[PDB]
Every structure is written in structure tokens, then in C-alpha cells.
Amino acid sequence: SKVLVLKSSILAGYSQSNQLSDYFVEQWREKHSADEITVRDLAANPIPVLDGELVGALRAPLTPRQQEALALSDELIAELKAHDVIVIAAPMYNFNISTQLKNYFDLVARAGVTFRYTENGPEGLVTGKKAIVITSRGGIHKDGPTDLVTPYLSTFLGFIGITDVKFVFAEGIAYGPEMAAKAQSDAKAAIDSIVSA
Amino acid sequence: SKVLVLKSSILAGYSQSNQLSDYFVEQWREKHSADEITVRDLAANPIPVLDGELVGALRAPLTPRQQEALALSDELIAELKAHDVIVIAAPMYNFNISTQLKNYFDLVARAGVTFRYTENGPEGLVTGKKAIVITSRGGIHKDGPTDLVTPYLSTFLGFIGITDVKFVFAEGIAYGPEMAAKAQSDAKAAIDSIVSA
Ligand SMILES: Cc1cc2nc3c(=O)[nH]c(=O)nc-3n(C[C@H](O)[C@H](O)[C@H](O)COP(=O)(O)O)c2cc1C
Ligand SMILES: Cc1cc2nc3c(=O)[nH]c(=O)nc-3n(C[C@H](O)[C@H](O)[C@H](O)COP(=O)(O)O)c2cc1C
Ligand SMILES: O=C1Oc2ccccc2C(=O)C1C[C@H]1C(=O)Oc2ccccc2C1=O
Ligand SMILES: O=C1Oc2ccccc2C(=O)C1C[C@H]1C(=O)Oc2ccccc2C1=O
User: Fold this and answer.
1) Among residues A92, A188, B66, B87, which is most buried (max CB within 10 A)?
2) Which residues span the membrane (chains A, B)?
3) Measured distance CA(B37)–CA(B83) in Å, rounded
4) C-alpha to C-alpha distances, A38 to A3, A35, A87, A153, B7, nearest whole angstrom
5) Three-state SS for A88?
6) Count of CB atoms situated within 10 Å of the CB of B29
7) Rounded to an integer, what distance in angstroms lies between the CA atom of residue B127 and that of residue A35?
8) Is A178 helix (H, G, I), strand (E, B) or coil?
9) Could you tell me the residue range of the domain that residue B90 belongs to?
């Protein structure tokens, strides 16, 4: 199969979610060595903000920026549809995903391409995929009312067709080195049983 | 009192939430004519994305961008703390708030300035405010599991100290002109009873 890995942290080499994504990649190479792996770093290779000009590109003549945004949109969507296993690193910043991941989503959700309207409702067109979300947090939010990242990621991914999603959590990072080490260990075992299952 | 109005739509003059915000302003001038009103349009006056360079500004020597981001942060925070009634236009795009509003939040949430850590927990420092959220949506999501915007806005605002929040909804816009007119009418009556209460 082909694996797509999306990195979205702004902390580069010090990112906890990037370290876990690299672990996921190392283990998939190990266990499934015939597979291809593509990594896109949405912080090191930024997607532009969706503004009032660029929204027109996804929807007569187009401006220079509009033409670039559309070309970028078609590229991102093709890449997404060309891979089988989608890994998404989703650190929580101010109770939301990172703006780096958000901008990718805003260029990826497009009527008649990644979803469509029908009489049985709106319908996702990115089908047959398996997704794994790796979500790191400073505090402890899991299964509680301050975690809106988790259900938002299920809702958005479900909307474009990706209903098979598994979640891996690295929480309690802000409490220090030893809690961060525990988070890393626990998340890595969660990953191990996904890679082998 | 002083009213702050934050606009975040990317659709300019065709925005449903901007039309409702202008109505709110017209009626507050009408009923409370001694008050001052400040409007910031976060689409027409964009806040930059929070990246790995700018996060350093909110936290030794600082780069040129870092210095600008910090100056902008201090301005936004002072403005927020200087007003009594905070009105926030929050259109839903791809099941999230707009990136234009998000960037404002990412520059506004800052340790030791808008919140702080204590032994009774983290604690908001923007206190004594009343907030009204005007949230427009194409579909119908209210009180259901696809509305993650509403609880995310309660959580983020509560975190910086603003626990008094009222919500005004304009839903069903994508169903056409007459449903949009109904949404406008219903939201406007919601606004009328806030302005007079
Ligand atoms: C700008 C900023 C905002 C943050 N907001 C939250 C927060 O909302 N809740 C939380 O539990 N931790 C928060 N944290 C801590 C991060 O979630 C934590 O450091 C996590 O490891 C981030 O993943 P990363 O290291 O891969 O970037 C924040 C950190 C920063 C940089
Ligand atoms: C980029 C884009 C994404 C949208 N996503 C959603 C959606 O997630 N759910 C929904 O009900 N409507 C969605 N809509 C419709 C808007 O929520 C609706 O048009 C609303 O009026 C937006 O507020 P505004 O007119 O003030 O910009 C979307 C529209 C656009 C432009
Ligand atoms: O829950 C916590 O309790 C603490 C107690 C003492 C010292 C640090 C912390 C934390 O970092 C967090 C997590 C934490 C959080 O829960 O929400 C946030 C929102 C915005 C920015 C940062 C954060 C956090 O670090
Ligand atoms: O629920 C709906 O049902 C429809 C039936 C027929 C024609 C149009 C629509 C809609 O626009 C929506 C709302 C709607 C929605 O619920 O989610 C979205 C997510 C991303 C982008 C746009 C949207 C929408 O327009």
C-alpha cells in the first residue's frame, strides 16, 4: 500500500507529534517494507490562508493567485486520493488544530471533487481510506468537554469520505520531561498495535 | 459603555454575519447613543498566521517579524481589555471558525497577559466582559453533533476569562434567498432582545 503522512506542528524538531510520526514511518518501513511512504510537512511547506480571492479558485477568468491556489488544490487532492493509509499529526493549539493543518483542509474540501450534494444528503468522495490521527496536547483533555479537536477531526474527515479513523493521544506534555516521556511511550505502543494489526 | 465588534467573514459585502453585525451596531447607536463602538474587520485587516518564528514573540533578542507580531499582539490585547461588550462574527467554514478569526485568537491567548497558571488551575485575566457571538451557517447544525464551533467558542472565551457569552444563530443559508431572509429575520429579533435587555 501507500502511506501519506501529514505533519502540522510549528515546533519543528522539538515537536512531540513529529517525533511520533517519524516513529510511525520507521515502524511501517520495518513491518511493511514493500510500501511507499510520502511525507508532507505543512509547516515547512506552508499552504496559504483561504481568503476572499482564493475561495473563488475552488468554485470566469481567474487572477494569478487564483490560478496558483487551484493548481495547489488539485495537487493536494490528487496526492490524498493516491494513497491508502492517511496519517495526520494534529497538535492542539488554543483548543483548535494548527492553522497549518486547517489551511490544508480549506484547500482540500471542494464541491464535486472531495464531496457532493445528493437527495440522501451531502456525500464524501474520498473513499476506501484508512486514517490515523496522532494528537499531542500539553494538558489532559481526552474524553472530556475541552476536547473539541477529536470530534471536529471525525466530523471533517467523515464529510470528505474518510469514516475509518483511529486516534492516538500524547497528553500531559506541559507537566514536564517525565510526563512527556510517558506520553511518548504510551502513544508508541498505540502505534505498534496499529502497524501490526 | 464601549462595544467591540470583530468581523471574520471572507465574503465582504455579501457576508450574512457582516450584515448582522452592522444591524447590531445600528441598533446600539439607536438605543445606547452615548456609547463608543469600535469595529475591526479581520479579513480586510488580516492577522498573520502563528508560525514557529512568531510563537517566540509571545513567549533573548527578537527578529524583525517577531517585533512586529509582538507590537500587534499588545495592540489587539489592549483593545480587547479596553471595551465592555465584545461582539464576535463567527461564520462556520469547513466545520471550524474562519482562519481570519483564528489568527486573532492565536495572537490574543498569551501566558501572564490574557491567562495564567495557578494551583486552583489555569485562570483567565480578561474579566468583567459581556460577549455576543453571531454565527452563520449554510446548513442546520444547532444543538447537534456537527456543531463544534459553538462549544469551542465557549471553551476558548472561558479560558481567557469571558464566561458571559450569548449566541445568535443564522442557519440554513445554503437553501436559498428565502431561507437566508428567514435566518436574517430570526437573528435580528435575537439581537433586538439583547440590545434592549
Ligand atoms: C501556541 C500554543 C498553544 C497551545 N495550546 C494548548 C491548549 O490549547 N491545550 C493544551 O492542552 N496544550 C496546548 N499547548 C501545548 C501543546 O498542545 C503541546 O506542546 C503539544 O506537544 C503540541 O504538539 P507539538 O509538540 O507536536 O507541536 C499549546 C502550545 C502552544 C505552542
Ligand atoms: C469555504 C466555505 C466553507 C463552508 N463550510 C460550511 C460548513 O462547514 N457547514 C455549513 O453549514 N456551511 C458552510 N458554508 C456556508 C457558510 O457557513 C454560509 O455561507 C455562512 O453564511 C457564512 O457566513 P458569511 O456569509 O458571513 O461568510 C461554507 C462556505 C464556504 C465559503
Ligand atoms: O492544564 C494545564 O495545567 C497546567 C498547570 C501548571 C502548569 C502548566 C499547565 C498546563 O500547561 C496545562 C495544559 C494547558 C491547557 O490545558 O490549556 C492551554 C491553553 C492555552 C495554552 C496552553 C495551555 C496549556 O499548557
Ligand atoms: O446541509 C446542507 O444540505 C444541502 C443540500 C443541498 C444543497 C446544499 C446543501 C448545503 O449547503 C448544506 C449545508 C452545508 C453543510 O452542511 O456542510 C458543508 C460543508 C462544507 C461546505 C459546504 C457545506 C454546506 O453548504
Assistant:
1) B87
2) none
3) 9
4) 6, 10, 10, 21, 38
5) strand
6) 12
7) 54
8) helix
9) 1-197
The technique is X-ray
What is the grid cell recorded at B185? 429575520
Task: Count the domains in chain B.
Answer: 1
> Which member of B10, B52, B102 has the closest CB to residue A96?
B102
Provide residues of A within 8 Å CB-CB of chain B.
Answer: 10-12, 43, 46, 49-52, 55, 93-97, 99-100, 102-103, 105-106, 109, 145-146, 148, 151-152, 155-156, 159
What CATH number does residue B180 fall under?
3.40.50.360
Q: What is the dihedral of CA A150, B46, A107, A8, to 10 degrees?
A: -50
